[PDB]
Amino acid sequence: GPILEKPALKNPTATLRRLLGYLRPHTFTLIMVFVFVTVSSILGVLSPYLIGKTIDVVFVPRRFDLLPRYMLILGTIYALTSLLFWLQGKIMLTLSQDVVFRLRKELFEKLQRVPVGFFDRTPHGDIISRVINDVDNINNVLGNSIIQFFSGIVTLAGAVIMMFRVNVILSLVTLSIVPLTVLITQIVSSQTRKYFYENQRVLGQLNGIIEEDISGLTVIKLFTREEKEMEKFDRVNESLRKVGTKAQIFSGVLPPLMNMVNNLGFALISGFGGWLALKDIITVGTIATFIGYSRQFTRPLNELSNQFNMIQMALASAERIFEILDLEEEKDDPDAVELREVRGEIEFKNVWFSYDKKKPVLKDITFHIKPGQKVALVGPTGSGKTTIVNLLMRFYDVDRGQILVDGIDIRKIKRSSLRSSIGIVLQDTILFSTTVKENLKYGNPGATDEEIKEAAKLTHSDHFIKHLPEGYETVLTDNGEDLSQGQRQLLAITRAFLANPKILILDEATSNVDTKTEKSIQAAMWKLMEGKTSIIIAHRLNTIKNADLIIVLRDGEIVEMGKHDELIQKRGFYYELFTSQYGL
Amino acid sequence: GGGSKTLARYLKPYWIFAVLAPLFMVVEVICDLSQPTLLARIVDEGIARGDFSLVLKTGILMLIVALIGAVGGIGCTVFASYASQNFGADLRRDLFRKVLSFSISNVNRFHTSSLITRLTNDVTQLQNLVMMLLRIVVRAPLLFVGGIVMAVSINVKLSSVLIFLIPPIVLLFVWLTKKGNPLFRKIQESTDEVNRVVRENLLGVRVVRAFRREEYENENFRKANESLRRSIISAFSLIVFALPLFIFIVNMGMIAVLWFGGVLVRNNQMEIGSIMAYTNYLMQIMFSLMMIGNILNFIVRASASAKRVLEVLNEKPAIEEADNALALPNVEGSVSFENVEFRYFENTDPVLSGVNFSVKPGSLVAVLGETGSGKSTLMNLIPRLIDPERGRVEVDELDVRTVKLKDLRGHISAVPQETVLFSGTIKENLKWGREDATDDEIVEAAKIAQIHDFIISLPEGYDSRVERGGRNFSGGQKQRLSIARALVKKPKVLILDDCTSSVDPITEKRILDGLKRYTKGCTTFIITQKIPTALLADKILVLHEGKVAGFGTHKELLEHCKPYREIYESQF
């Protein structure tokens, strides 16, 4: 659709240079195409010349004995023209696709190595559409738009040169339609762009009204808002009818207008040509040849003008892709060492962290965990008990203070061993659209399914898993949509168990679980933590009682600590939270 | 069955526009078909006979015909635009008018996502189809048929070469379509796979990272990357061979015209101008035949929109007010269920069954049960959003099927599980229950809903902007916003479907305690899957697996109601 504004360029040549680097291994092949496009465009301007020449040599002097010779040359000129199009096309097809394949490979590798922060800042839908469109823009311009733009140049120049070498005046007559084409196109273009966007504005509003009203129909009916909603729809719709008609008009008048310019050219060539034939200044075949050029200066000009705009639009997208490829990557340290087989000591020392560096999230957090101890970090929303998990998994890094596991600072540890020695079951973990057996295997690749079923029983999963349509072979499309949430929390528990880390973080939800599975998920929690250090964002009564340590959080500050019974008596904050929720 | 609704009625009131567009287009076509004959006249009857007037006057005449055909084409576009646009406006309105009347069960059939695409995309598709029918659907087949007429008009014999040129082209189009269709569809399958792998890697990045499985994901992206590459080469190699072969056939058209026509001028049966006119008519016929092929490709996709749009237009609303429905100037808040059974789809077992219970006006009752016990459905029966399959539902001892919907719903306020807000201002959203509501009354409700302080700390406060769906507010403040919105209505029945999901446990009690002093004289239902919340109400209704298990207080239920014990066991 009609472009809004021309893209800003942070030196297009540097990005051009870089983008041309992807074309270096296929240079020999790329030269070959340019000469194909070159010769196939020249042979394309020769055709209407021979048609005039045949008329002048074979038809007019009645010298028909020369006909099979002229038709043989044409028949091969044509054959080669289409032979070259097929080559030029199929060569660039698997050439440009081989490029964006690389770009797709590289961008995805960037995904698995970029800091997790970028996925937390910008919406996932945005960063895929913006990226996949940019990749497509390159693909479009590389495989089609460039060679079509080049062909347009050779063809256009080829026709003008040969036109002038036949007759100068008739060339000036034909080229008279160029300023008409440019004047007309420019005017219609601006109008089309204007009302395109004016219509896009009103339509997006109208569509907005539709999407939300259908999604919130139940509310609209509860508030008996049908009429008011209908009235809101009407006034926009009635105004879309009016603008859409205008957008539709100006987006549709360039073809009859271009056609007219073609017919105006045909007329001039026929009149001025025929009137130059009646003075022996030109031949009749000459007139035929110029007619063969009468449409060469309308739409092919516009194609050039718009293929040029796709080029710009492409380079801008190239400039975006390269920057994503230039982002910093999570690398380890040369002094970062592998984890010794310890039992799991965790420690925070006056740690400060936030996300936007303006509003603090954790302020002066300091605590110590002993190997084996189940620890429950409790608190209301706005505490930071969830922010703990990220810092401890090094998805983020602390600003002030330091976190350390088993005596060595977490930032001086290889991420590989750290994330192997530490498990994690987030509040709403993510499953994959594969099989149950494959999902539970995700933690330990080299683990036989005979061993999995043995471990699947030790978390209360083996029952409902075999009661599935295809048992363990069952494919759970859309990340377990056909499974109840309670069953998926189980699968997450079974999965984390198979990885077998010596440190555990747990955020088991309690909200929408059925009481049956509820007793089996907590039984699974006991077998889960059996043998390792555990940190639990608790929402259950029977876990904050068995807690070897409770650490109470509030407003980013660690306020209270100590065991359950002890914290009830202080009457400070834990007692509040407890009696204002368990004081039934 | 199905329905007799028809989309050809949205065009009827613009029939004048719908007939001028094709007529104006034929003028363009006649003017476009005239040029090669006038050229042949210039050479055969002008140059050949040496008279300037002939060449001059027909030369001028070709200009006049060009502009005339220009008026033709613009006039078609203009008129087709009106007809096209008014059609889509009229279509869209009724589509929206229908959807507004739909019930839970209606929406349950055309899923909400498909419903939106049916009113947005399909409406534009159909708009385009009508635009198309009134311009190029007239143009192309007229050039094709008129071009053949002209060639026949110039020389019957030479026209036989059209019998040789047309079948291979049609055969080419048939082959390309039948072979390219499943190969293009294969691209969509390979594209979605690329999209899925990227999404799941974004979605569960912390999972793939922590499990040290990044390299396994690169491996799985290569499979989707290669499949997409493969399916795109194999498909577009067809197109990349189709276009040059089409042009070749057309160019051998020229060859045949000059060769077969060459032996016709030699026999003094066809002048030299007629050959020039014939070559142009030849290209006209061929390119038009190509445009017709593309039209055919779009129609088959367009009609899928016609069917989808028609299904909505043919859908009867499941909930209807009776002709002589009772008016309810007031409601006490008595609410009863007698042997209520409910099912969403008739392939499953009931989601409610043998539901028998009553509630005196003014009472605060906690409806409590595990996940999927039927609580939300049970509540949905009260404002006639759904109907019992068996049994009935009463409000003030009246079957709700008997009372006016605007009346019944005007006295019931619900607070749905999933919270939805609407574009505009906070004050606009909150006044959804009362447009005569004053600011004091609104602040009142928001205070009880524990949201007035959040609102008051906004730069524009109550005039702050609500973005589509309430996306700019968190789940916590949205919930509270709708609670306030519920209370401004001043209901005689108040339903709170699990609406403590996104607030602090402490803030929760603050909300519910204030209801007592503001819902003074209001039958209240408080729906929850957790016992502490249910204990706030005077009496607890316990649902388990679609049936009512018990109805009393904590002591009674702890002794006699076994499903209540299971809940207690799972929580304490």
Ligand SMILES: Nc1ncnc2c1ncn2[C@@H]1O[C@H](COP(=O)(O)OP(=O)(O)NP(=O)(O)O)[C@@H](O)[C@H]1O
């Ligand atoms: N719109 C719908 N279409 C079809 N089935 C539904 C629909 N809504 C709910 N169901 C099913 O009907 C049963 C009862 O649903 P519902 O009354 O929503 O459970 P609930 O316990 O009130 N919700 P929650 O408390 O949040 O778990 C469940 O098994 C649902 O799967």
Ligand SMILES: [Mg+2]
């Ligand atoms: Mg519910």
